[PDB]
PDB file of C-alpha atoms and ligand atoms in Angstrom:
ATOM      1  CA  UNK A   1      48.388 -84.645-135.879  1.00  0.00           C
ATOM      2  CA  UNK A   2      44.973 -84.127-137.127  1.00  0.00           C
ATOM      3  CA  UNK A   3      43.318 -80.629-135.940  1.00  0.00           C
ATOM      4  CA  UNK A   4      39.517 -81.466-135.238  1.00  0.00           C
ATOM      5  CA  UNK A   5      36.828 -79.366-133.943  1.00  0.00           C
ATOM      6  CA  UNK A   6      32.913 -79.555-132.676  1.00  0.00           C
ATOM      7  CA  UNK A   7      30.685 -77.093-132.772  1.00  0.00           C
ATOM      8  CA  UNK A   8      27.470 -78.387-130.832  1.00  0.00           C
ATOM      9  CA  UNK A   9      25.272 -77.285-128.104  1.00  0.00           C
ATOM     10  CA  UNK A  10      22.839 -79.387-125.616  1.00  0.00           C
ATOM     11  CA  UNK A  11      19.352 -78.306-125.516  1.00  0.00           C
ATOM     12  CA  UNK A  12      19.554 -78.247-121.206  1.00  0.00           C
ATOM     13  CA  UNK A  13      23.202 -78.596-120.756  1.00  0.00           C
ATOM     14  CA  UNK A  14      23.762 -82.303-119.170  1.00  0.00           C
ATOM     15  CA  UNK A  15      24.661 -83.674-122.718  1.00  0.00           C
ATOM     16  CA  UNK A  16      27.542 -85.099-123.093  1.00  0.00           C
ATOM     17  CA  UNK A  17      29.485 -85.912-126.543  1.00  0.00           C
ATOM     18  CA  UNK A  18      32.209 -87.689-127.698  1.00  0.00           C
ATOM     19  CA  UNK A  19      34.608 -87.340-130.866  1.00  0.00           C
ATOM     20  CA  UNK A  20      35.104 -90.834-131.965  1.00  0.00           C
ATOM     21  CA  UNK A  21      37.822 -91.489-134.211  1.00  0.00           C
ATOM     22  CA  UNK A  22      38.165 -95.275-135.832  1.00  0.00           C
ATOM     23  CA  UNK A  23      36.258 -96.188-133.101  1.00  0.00           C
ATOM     24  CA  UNK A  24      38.303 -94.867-130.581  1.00  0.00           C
ATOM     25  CA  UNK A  25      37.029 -92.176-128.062  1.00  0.00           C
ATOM     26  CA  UNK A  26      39.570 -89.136-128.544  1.00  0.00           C
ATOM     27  CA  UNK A  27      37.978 -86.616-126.228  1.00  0.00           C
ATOM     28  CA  UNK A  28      34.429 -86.191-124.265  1.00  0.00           C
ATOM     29  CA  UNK A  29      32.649 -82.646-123.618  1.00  0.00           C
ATOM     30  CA  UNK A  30      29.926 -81.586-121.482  1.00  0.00           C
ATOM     31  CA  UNK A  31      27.915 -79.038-123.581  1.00  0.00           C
ATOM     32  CA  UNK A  32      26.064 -75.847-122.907  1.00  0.00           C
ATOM     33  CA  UNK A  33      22.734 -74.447-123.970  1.00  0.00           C
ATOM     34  CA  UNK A  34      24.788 -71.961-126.365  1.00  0.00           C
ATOM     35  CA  UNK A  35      27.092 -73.057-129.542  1.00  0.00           C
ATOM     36  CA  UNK A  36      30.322 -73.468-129.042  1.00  0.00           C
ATOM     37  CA  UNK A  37      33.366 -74.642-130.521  1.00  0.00           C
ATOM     38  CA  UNK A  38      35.464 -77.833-128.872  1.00  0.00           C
ATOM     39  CA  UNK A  39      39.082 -78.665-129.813  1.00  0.00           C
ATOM     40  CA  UNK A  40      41.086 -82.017-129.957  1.00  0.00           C
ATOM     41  CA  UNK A  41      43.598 -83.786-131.928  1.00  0.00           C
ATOM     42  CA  UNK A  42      44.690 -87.062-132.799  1.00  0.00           C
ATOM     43  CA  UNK A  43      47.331 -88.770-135.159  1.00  0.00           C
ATOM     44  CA  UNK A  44      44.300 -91.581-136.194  1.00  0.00           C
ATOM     45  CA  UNK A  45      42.248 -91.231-139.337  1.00  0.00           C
ATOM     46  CA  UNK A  46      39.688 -93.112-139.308  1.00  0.00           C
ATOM     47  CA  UNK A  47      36.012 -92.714-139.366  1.00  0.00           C
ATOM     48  CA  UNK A  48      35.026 -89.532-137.553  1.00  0.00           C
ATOM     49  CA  UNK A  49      31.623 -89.793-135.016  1.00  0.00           C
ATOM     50  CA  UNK A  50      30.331 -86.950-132.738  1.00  0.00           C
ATOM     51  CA  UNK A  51      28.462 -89.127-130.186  1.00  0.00           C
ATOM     52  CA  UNK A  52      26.093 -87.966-128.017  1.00  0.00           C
ATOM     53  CA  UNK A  53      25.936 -91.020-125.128  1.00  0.00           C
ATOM     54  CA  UNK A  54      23.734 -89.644-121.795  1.00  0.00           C
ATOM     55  CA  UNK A  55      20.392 -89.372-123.477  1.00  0.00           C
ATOM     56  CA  UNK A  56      17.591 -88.802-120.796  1.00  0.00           C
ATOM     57  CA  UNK A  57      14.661 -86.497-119.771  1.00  0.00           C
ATOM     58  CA  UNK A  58      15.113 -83.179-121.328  1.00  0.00           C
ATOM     59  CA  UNK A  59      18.857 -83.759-123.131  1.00  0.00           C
ATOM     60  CA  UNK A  60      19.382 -83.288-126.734  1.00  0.00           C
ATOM     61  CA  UNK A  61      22.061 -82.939-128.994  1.00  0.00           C
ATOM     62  CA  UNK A  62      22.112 -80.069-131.970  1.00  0.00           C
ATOM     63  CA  UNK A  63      25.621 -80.017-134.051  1.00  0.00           C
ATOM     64  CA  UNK A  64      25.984 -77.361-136.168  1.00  0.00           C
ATOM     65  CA  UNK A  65      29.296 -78.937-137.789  1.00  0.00           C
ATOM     66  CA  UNK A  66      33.015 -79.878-137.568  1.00  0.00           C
ATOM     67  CA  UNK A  67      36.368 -78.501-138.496  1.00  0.00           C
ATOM     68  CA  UNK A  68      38.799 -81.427-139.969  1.00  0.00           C
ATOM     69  CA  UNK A  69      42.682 -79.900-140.943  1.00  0.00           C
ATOM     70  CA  UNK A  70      40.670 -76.335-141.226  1.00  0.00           C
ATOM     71  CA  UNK A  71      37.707 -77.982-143.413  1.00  0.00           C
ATOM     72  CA  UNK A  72      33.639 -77.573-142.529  1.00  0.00           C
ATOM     73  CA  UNK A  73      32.034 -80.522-142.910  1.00  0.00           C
ATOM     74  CA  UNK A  74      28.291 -79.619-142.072  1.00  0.00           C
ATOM     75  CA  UNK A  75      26.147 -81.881-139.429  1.00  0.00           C
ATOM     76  CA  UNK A  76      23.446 -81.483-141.973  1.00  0.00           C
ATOM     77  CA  UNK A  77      25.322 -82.490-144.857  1.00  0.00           C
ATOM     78  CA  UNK A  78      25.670 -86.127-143.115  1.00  0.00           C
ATOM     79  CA  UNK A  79      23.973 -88.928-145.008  1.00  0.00           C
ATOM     80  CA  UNK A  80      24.714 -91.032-141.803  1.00  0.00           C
ATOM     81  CA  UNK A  81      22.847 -89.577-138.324  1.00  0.00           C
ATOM     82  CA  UNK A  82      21.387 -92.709-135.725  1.00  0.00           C
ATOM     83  CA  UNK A  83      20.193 -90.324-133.297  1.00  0.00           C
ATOM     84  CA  UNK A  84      17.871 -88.171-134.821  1.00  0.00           C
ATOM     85  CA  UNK A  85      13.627 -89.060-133.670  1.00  0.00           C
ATOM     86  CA  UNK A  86      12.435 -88.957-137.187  1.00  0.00           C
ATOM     87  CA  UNK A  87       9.663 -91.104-138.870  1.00  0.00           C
ATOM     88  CA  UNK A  88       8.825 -92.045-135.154  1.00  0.00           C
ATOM     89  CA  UNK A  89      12.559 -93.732-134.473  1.00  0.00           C
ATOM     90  CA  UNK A  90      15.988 -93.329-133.824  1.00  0.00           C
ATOM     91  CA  UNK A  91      18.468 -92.372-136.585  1.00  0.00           C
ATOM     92  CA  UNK A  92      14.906 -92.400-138.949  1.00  0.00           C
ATOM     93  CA  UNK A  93      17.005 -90.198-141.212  1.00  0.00           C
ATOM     94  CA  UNK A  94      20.096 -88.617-142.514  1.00  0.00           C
ATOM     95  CA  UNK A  95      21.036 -84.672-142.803  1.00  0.00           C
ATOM     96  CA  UNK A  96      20.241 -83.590-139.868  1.00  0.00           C
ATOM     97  CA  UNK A  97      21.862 -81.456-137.248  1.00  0.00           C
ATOM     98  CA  UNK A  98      20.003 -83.451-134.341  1.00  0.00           C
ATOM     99  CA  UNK A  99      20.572 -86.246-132.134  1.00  0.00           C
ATOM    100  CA  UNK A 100      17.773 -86.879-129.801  1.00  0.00           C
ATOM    101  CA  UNK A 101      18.150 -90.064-129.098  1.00  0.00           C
ATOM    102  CA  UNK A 102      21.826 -91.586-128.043  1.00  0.00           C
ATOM    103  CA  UNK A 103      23.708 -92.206-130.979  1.00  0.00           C
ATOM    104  CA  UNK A 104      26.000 -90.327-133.763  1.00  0.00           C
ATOM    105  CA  UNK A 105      26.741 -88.308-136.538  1.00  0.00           C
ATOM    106  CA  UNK A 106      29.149 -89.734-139.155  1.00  0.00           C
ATOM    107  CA  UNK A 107      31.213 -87.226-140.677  1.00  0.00           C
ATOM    108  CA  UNK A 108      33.589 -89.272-142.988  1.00  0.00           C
ATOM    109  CA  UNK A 109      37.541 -90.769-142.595  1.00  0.00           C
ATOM    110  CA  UNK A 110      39.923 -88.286-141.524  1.00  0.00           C
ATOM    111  CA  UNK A 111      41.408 -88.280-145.061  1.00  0.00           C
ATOM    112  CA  UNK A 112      39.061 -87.707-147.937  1.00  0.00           C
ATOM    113  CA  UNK A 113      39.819 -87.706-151.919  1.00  0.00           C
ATOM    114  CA  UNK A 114      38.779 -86.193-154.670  1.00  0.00           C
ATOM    115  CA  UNK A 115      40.545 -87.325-158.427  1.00  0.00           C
ATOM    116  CA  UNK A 116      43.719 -87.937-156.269  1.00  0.00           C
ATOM    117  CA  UNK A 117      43.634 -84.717-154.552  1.00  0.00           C
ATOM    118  CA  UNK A 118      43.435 -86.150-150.327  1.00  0.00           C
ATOM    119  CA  UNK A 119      42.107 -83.516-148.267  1.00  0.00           C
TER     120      UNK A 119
HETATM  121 CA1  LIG B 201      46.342 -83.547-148.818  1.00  0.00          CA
END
């Protein structure tokens, strides 16, 4: 299986997040107030999402980055984010660490390629 992991932190601790994998929902985390690393795996290789889905008063979102097969792919290296409040709305940009509002961080398939190398 694929080895995937989360390194994210809530800004008050009720947020909760969710690795999405091809759409499916692989695993769900309360967070802390400190950064922290959270493990799962799964055989699917689709399109990975970190999700954060209880957005209220005081709860926010910050992902640092994820760990795919022992690979950082940086939250801020994203070009696709639909949570972060920028240009006064959700998801107003990409590259960004934050989701404010409910919503995601894309971080690519599984399975990436480069001149036939898949990584
Ligand atoms: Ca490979």
């Amino acid at each position: 299986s694929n080895s995937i992991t989360v390194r994210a932190r809530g800004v008050n601790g009720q947020e909760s997040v969710s690795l999405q994998v091809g759409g499916t929902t692989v695993q769900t985390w309360t967070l802390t107030t400190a950064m922290q690393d959270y493990t799962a795996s799964t055989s699917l290789t689709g399109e990975i999402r970190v999700a954060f889905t209880n957005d209220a008063t005081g709860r926010d979102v910050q992902v640092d980055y994820i760990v795919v097969n022992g690979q950082t792919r940086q939250a801020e290296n994203q070009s696709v984010n639909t949570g972060v409040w920028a240009n006064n709305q959700c998801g107003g940009s990409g590259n960004s660490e934050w989701l404010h509002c409910n919503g995601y961080i894309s971080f690519g398939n599984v399975s990436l390629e480069h001149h036939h190398h898949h990584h």
